[PDB]
Amino acid sequence: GMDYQEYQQFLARINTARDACVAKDIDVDLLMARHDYFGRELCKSLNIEYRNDVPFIDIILDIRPEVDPLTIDAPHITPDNYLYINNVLYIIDYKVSVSNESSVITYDKYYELTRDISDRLSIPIEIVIIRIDPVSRDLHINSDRFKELYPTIVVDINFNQFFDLKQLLYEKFGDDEEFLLKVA
Ligand SMILES: O=C1c2c(O)c(=O)ccn2N([C@H]2c3ccccc3SCc3c2ccc(F)c3F)[C@@H]2COCCN12
Ligand SMILES: [Mn+2]
């Protein structure tokens, strides 16, 4: 599961919170930690270095190190990770969601903004959204090309600890109207 030091920090934050807005920050942080926890376990399965929100220009400079960083027309996107293999750039983003809604938003955006730099570099750029459903624990990957690259991708984890911390948060703030309708 998640780190013991990380778990206790959430538990301390929940026990000291008295205010809805602080409680919603803990809620958004639980989602971020849950996402990052998935990323690290996924990256282990894919045998790639764990990364998060890496600037696209740093990706171009890694795969094509002769490119002038001062004068390259690159998109201003920060994908979770990438894999450059057989002159194909796979742009990876981690998702933890019961819905594909957030996947379609990220795909449509990353696809549209990588067409030009793909033409410029003469490198095909494949957008790979890797989503785990946190209930079913099923792994859904859009990219056929990415799935043909790898053996069947298995990320055998659960989010029971995240569910538990969220449950404690709602024990304490479940009757706070300001918390229940808090966005942050
Ligand atoms: O890196 C991400 C990102 C993802 O890669 C993602 O898959 C889902 C969501 N993301 N993001 C979320 C985020 C990420 C993970 C879990 C919950 C949240 S909830 C709002 C929020 C994010 C990041 C910072 C922040 F201050 C936020 F309030 C932002 C959005 O766009 C830029 C980069 N990014
Ligand atoms: Mn990200």
Ligand SMILES: [Mn+2]
């Ligand atoms: Mn992500």
Ligand SMILES: [Mn+2]
């Ligand atoms: Mn695997």
